[model samples]
Target: MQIFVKTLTGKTITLEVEPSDTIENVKAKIQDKEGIPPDQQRLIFAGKQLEDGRTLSDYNIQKESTLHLVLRLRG
Candidate 1:
């Protein structure tokens, strides 16, 4: 299934991903093309946090789902 990643610039990057792929895997692709590191990026799916160590489909995010990309800041 494909997923949509909405960046801070209000741009959407369409990811041709698989349900079997983990969040970290997708983030690697995101960093490759979008330049956002996994540790610095936070993807929120309908208010649910997407973290590493779990598959994308583990959350069962819709094939047409859009995940918002938020920045993780430090003090």
Candidate 2:
């Protein structure tokens, strides 16, 4: 599936993934794509927060939907 991750600062990332892919997997993609680490990343969708250990299907994540990306400060 292909989804968009729109950052708090307005950066849009296109993610290619599988339903079985863990949220942690997505985090690393965000990390690799934008140099933001997974620990500092948070994924939000349909007002729900994403869990690192869960797969996308576990959250019933939809395809082509935009997931909101909010980052925690690196302090």
Candidate 3:
């Protein structure tokens, strides 16, 4: 499955992933591409926080699904 990810900076990236891939795996990919650490990344899909333990299939994520990525900022 292919997923569309949008960052807080208005950057959009497309990722090719498997339905069996865990959300944590996606986060790792994002970390590699965007330089954001997994722990600092907050991924949201369908208006809910995407859980690391859940698979893409578990969330019913389809092709071209948009995921919002927010970087946690410290005060």
Q: Whose TM-score is greatest here?
A: 3
What would the per-residue lDDT of candidate 1 be over residues 1-75, giving only the tens digit for each residue? Answer: 789998778999888888889889988989898776788888888688888878888988778889888878643
The regions of model 3 sitting more than 4 angstroms off are: 73-75
**Residue 27, candidate 2: alpha-carbon lDDT:** 95
TM per prediction:
0.86, 0.88, 0.90
Clashing residue pairs found in predicted model 1: none
lDDT of 2 by residue, 1-75 (tens): 898999878978899988899999999988888898889987998798898999988978879878999989777
Lowest summed lDDT across 10 adjacent residues in model 1 is found at: 66-75
lDDT of 3 by residue, 1-75 (tens): 789999878989998899899999999998888788898988898899999999989988998889998888643
List the RMSD of every prediction in angstroms.
1.5, 1.5, 1.7
Say which prediction, candidate 2 or candidate 3, comes out ahead on lDDT: 3
Output the better candidate (1/3) by lDDT.
Answer: 3
* Model 3 poorest 10 in a row by lDDT: 66-75
